[PDB]
Design a protein around this ligand. Structure first.
Ligand SMILES: Cc1cc2nc3c(=O)[nH]c(=O)nc-3n(C[C@H](O)[C@H](O)[C@H](O)COP(=O)(O)OP(=O)(O)OC[C@H]3O[C@@H](n4cnc5c(N)ncnc54)[C@H](O)[C@@H]3O)c2cc1C
Ligand SMILES: Cc1cc2nc3c(=O)[nH]c(=O)nc-3n(C[C@H](O)[C@H](O)[C@H](O)COP(=O)(O)OP(=O)(O)OC[C@H]3O[C@@H](n4cnc5c(N)ncnc54)[C@H](O)[C@@H]3O)c2cc1C
Lengths: 576, 576, 104, 52
């Protein structure tokens, strides 16, 4: 291991890979550290759902997600167990057991918040939705010039969409996708617009989608190699990055202190440029362990030297969720162009349609698939083919419906096992609220309790803000009940509900961006540089300082691309 | 991909890897096909539990196991869902949905039986116990000379133990381990012997154990390579092997028909020698899809042409399970050698002991750990150090207790512990019964229903035989209840229970071994060669024809090694 | 607060309560058996609109209580069964069993 | 609880729950036979199961 690099990046998630891709491509000598390990196959940091086996068994992937997500702050457990044998060791109090955080108020938690420590980060298992934010949800990159701001976000998002391979066409021939898209489009005609979820993914075959991940952005292979002979990059897995060292004037970072988990050694790594992309919780943890913000229970009667806004104004979206079972009417409509004669299972049975008929409700491709299904599987009571891909439908956030929507099927940590109802009938509904940033909503770190890597234990003090955020969240639940009823009734066991705070994993604003540190109550500027420091940049959702409802990764990636522009304007790569 | 090899092996679990180690090492040109993919990291087919993150969070590994195990035969669901919306599409019958198997009788199933399709097979997540079988559980390799049989088994087991890196001291300095071991040793003094579970694992540090896997047997890297310039091996993942092609005379296999899951193309591969190691279920499926045994619901009115015993005489172990919470008396004895001054937390707190004082009940390595724990964590009410390794205690199968026992902690698809009771207190009890082989106990394949890979759907017809197997199983339950109570009372939520048939995953006898095809009712001889065929061999637990309680993998491995000795004597490597 | 919204069901000849000629109940009388589905058309469409109306209405008072989320209850839990010996003016014209004096 | 106690179900279909974890020595059913008051005439999917 070299001990000198041009650029060091902490975290190998898709935002650290954005910095790699830009900086390695421009000739910088780059090192990347991840506390976690290469597990995902020969494609380093690739999506774990890209196996034939998972794509044949997509519900099983929930268990993989559950397995790698580690809860961020678990309050002390107060469950009463009073049927132990009288001989068994029995506690007298609810003591600190099994990694729990006694700093945590159980009623002001994001109990669902969790992290993933693996090479590629959460992109090894995310659901790949990458919508753009409209102006109302998005921070300003240019003030007092809206068309210039729009133009800058358009250039960055388009680039970001190329890195992720974002598209809106991978599900265009699914019968279920079109059944639901067309119905919603018709019902809301001229009030709301429906489209495919923009997905970071490339379809390889009718039954397989290559989901994008960090690996798609940057392949994570050591360089130089035969494909990039003039580039320089080294990834170091199983390395915990613990602290950046500030110079005495707080104008520069002088080193990164690391802990190699396999050998035990602890080193200082020196770079020209330090990039932190360890996630919204862990960027904040590393900064606070390095003398930024305030360690310990916040204490206003004692102002921090540096970055007083760090870990305040945190935002996390409200999530409401339900599943439906498709209406009898919609399922009958699937075979509306068909002529069916005879009884299924006898030689006289047949299913035909008129190709190209002007008054057909469906296109020939749909009707051929129905026909074939019904004719080859005459025991099956449904018209939807067995390997039909899932619906992937959205109506994006608008002023009149200020929440993001997904009307689809995919794997999340809270997916349930359902066996009794045919899966072809079931559609998931996920509506995502925006949360106003408030100073009182905080991520802070204990000065006593440490986590499993011996770093300061994360602690949340969070409630959804009263006012607009809470009114929108309840309106959004109503919207989901109203809209979902157009498609079918709720699936028993997946009735409409707010999910545990944080489960949606879209935390932002922990190290937030703005034009001016004091006036905009922020930590980094629009180049993602930490105020006061020449050579320290932060990337990730933590930078986003606005109330958003749409999934944030694409936006965070776009900020990282602008950040790399600034780096390339201000630091020169070492000669090879 | 060449079309011609010396040896082809179907399956990359630890039994396939045994054939690979032996034959690639003896110079054969070998190819290995697996239907699943490389996921586990840059060590191909390595144990997934070997990440720093799993080992700091071992309870999460349960979720990984759940995600990768796919149920073999799921009967048609008959749960009544009568609270659907009146608008939702509603069933008239319990039709076949969600991959269920309409051939399956739900009351004669191995409902717990499941398979893993990944490179390395189940060894990417197993619990690494590798006991030898005593005479009573083991098939004869030598007729009419018990001491020669014994010597041949000892020679094979000792190689197998070398391949797996089997050891019995990786847990020797665990407090919890020794606390349980010592107490059980004393309670059964002169009646039963206790020891460490033999485990395929190597300890690397006080907090890290490298669990063994297929990778340990053979690293699965293509050859020739720098480290092995004279060897020849190619691994082809994501290739479903579908049929071995019999010659018209039923004397030889002429090719292996494969489906490349990524390109979609179907090929025939030629080899001199064909080795099937796809697991006890899928070896059987592949043979039946190739014209061996009988396809469809068994029909005596129609003897099959070849291997009439294929899929009959199947065995699976009964499994009883509970968890206990450590007794107060045992917990108090952990600290019996300590001198304690004053009062925890308070200034003057000191904990000491006298190294070597024969009045000590415990060794110095133990007291040093207790002492350090109690001084560095004075708030914690227990004297077991937080990083203490798990217990791994067994008393092996004996005539007077004819069941294998594990008294330990490890990750399985069930048995997830929880957060109310300190995990240092908890011990798992798994007792495993032996099941008599009976002809009427069968694994068969549908002639109409197919599985997710379009192969004949496996179907079980199984009950624990009445008589000894059933009597033993109930005696085993009582034995667990009596034994467990010397250590602590049951943990609420893990009370003593029989586990669902097949969850233990120790299925045997589906393609069983013997001396004589007809007199021994078997499919392969003691070289693992399919009767009548020159060039077809099977490996795995499916070979074992006896009633066994212990974990079968080491025994399967031993038979594979004998098989390789036959192959080496009877086929010549192509020139290199 | 509890929210209970009750829909009306169209009377359909095919929805029946009949009694076994073989199986008996606890008092040695013919075992009741149902053959029932909510009629498609108006009854079903109203019932779903009624669900939506409860979600829209209840939200004005508060959000759902976890563990008591909006759901259809098991058919008949409501115990308002009717029409098993129905009233009308004319036995044949009105497919009924009793007249407006409740006389058979 | 008073109410649940006095309400007797009018037609309970034959139960077809799978209990496959009985001890091997326990008496075990080969079919889903008529148990504990259930009604074999009743189609489980066209019932008023809450009628009592
Ligand atoms: C199930 C699921 C579904 C999701 N769906 C979507 C969606 O559809 N759309 C969307 O936009 N987002 C979604 N997300 C969220 C998305 O995955 C994250 O926003 C994204 O991965 C954030 O990227 P990142 O690079 O900032 O952080 P991460 O991906 O979290 O990567 C940060 C990394 O740094 C590491 N690290 C942490 N601390 C240290 C340290 N001290 N030293 C060294 N390394 C460290 C980690 O091990 C990790 O690799 C989903 C995620 C989940 C789990
Ligand atoms: C949680 C867990 C705990 C366990 N603990 C223990 C224990 O402690 N000790 C004990 O002895 N064992 C235990 N086992 C069982 C042990 O893992 C198996 O006995 C062992 O892996 C069998 O080895 P194998 O090589 O025969 O088969 P497998 O490991 O099942 O490998 C068979 C392989 O062949 C493949 N395949 C299947 N069909 C095809 C096909 N048609 N074409 C091509 N490839 C195919 C698979 O994808 C797979 O990789 C445990 C299992 C699990 C899941």
């Amino acid at each position: 291991m070299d001990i000198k690099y041009d650029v060091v990046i902490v975290g190998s998630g898709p935002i650290g890979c954005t910095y790699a891709r830009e900086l390695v491509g421009a000739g910088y000598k780059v090192a990347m550290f991840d506390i976690g390990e290469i597990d995902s196959g020969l494609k380093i940091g690739a999506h774990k759902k890209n196996t034939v086996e998972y794509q044949k068994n997509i519900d099983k992937f929930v268990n993989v997600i559950q397995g790698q997500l580690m809860s961020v702050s678990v309050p002390v457990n107060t469950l009463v167990v009073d049927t132990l044998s009288p001989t068994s060791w029995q506690a007298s109090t609810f003591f600190v057991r099994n990694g729990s955080n006694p700093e945590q108020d159980p009623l002001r938690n994001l109990s669902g918040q969790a992290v993933t420590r693996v090479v590629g980060g959460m992109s090894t298992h995310w659901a790949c939705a990458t919508p753009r934010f409209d102006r109302e949800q998005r921070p300003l990159l240019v003030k007092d010039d809206a068309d210039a701001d729009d133009a800058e976000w358009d250039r960055l998002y388009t680039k970001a969409e190329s890195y992720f391979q974002t598209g809106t066409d991978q599900f265009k021939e699914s019968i279920r996708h079109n059944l639901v898209l067309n119905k919603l489009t018709e019902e809301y005609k001229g009030q709301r617009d429906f489209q495919q979820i923009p997905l970071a993914a490339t379809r390889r075959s009718p039954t397989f989608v290559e989901w994008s991940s960090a690996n798609t952005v940057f392949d994570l292979q050591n360089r130089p190699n035969t494909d990039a002979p003039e580039e320089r990059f080294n990834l170091f897995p199983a390395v915990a990055c613990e602290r950046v060292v500030r110079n005495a004037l707080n104008s520069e970072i002088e080193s990164l202190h690391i802990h190699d988990l396999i050998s035990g050694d602890r080193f200082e790594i020196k770079a020209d440029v330090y990039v932190l992309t360890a996630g919204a919780v862990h960027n904040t943890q590393l900064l606070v362990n390095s003398g930024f913000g305030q360690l310990g229970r916040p204490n206003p009667a004692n102002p921090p030297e540096l970055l007083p806004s760090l870990g305040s104004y945190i935002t996390e979206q409200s999530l409401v969720f339900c599943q439906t079972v498709m209406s009898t009417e919609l399922i009958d409509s699937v075979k509306s162009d068909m002529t069916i004669r005879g009884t299924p299972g006898e030689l006289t049975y047949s299913v035909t349609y008129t190709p190209g008929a002007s008054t057909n409700k469906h296109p020939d491709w749909w009707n051929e698939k129905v026909k074939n299904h019904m004719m080859q599987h005459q025991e099956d009571p449904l018209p939807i083919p067995f390997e039909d891909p899932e619906p992937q439908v959205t109506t994006l956030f608008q002023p009149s419906h200020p929440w993001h929507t997904q009307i689809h099927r995919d794997a999340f940590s809270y997916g349930a096992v359902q066996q009794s109802i045919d899966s072809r009938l079931i559609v998931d509904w996920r509506f995502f609220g925006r949360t106003e940033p408030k100073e009182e909503n905080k991520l802070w770190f204990s000065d006593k309790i440490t986590d499993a890597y011996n770093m300061p234990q994360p602690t949340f003090d969070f409630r959804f803000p009263a006012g607009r955020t809470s009114k929108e969240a309840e309106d959004m639940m109503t919207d989901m009940c109203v809209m979902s009823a157009k498609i079918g009734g709720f699936l028993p066991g997946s009735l409409p509900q707010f999910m545990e705070p944080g489960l949606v994993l879209h935390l932002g604003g922990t190290h937030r961006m703005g034009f001016d540190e004091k006036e905009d109550n922020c930590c980094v500027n629009t180049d993602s540089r930490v105020f006061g420091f020449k050579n320290l940049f932060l990337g990730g959702c933590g930078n986003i300082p606005t109330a958003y409802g749409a999934n944030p990764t694409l936006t965070a990636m776009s900020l990282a691309i602008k950040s790399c522009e600034y780096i390339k304007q201000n630091f020169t790569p070492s000669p090879f």
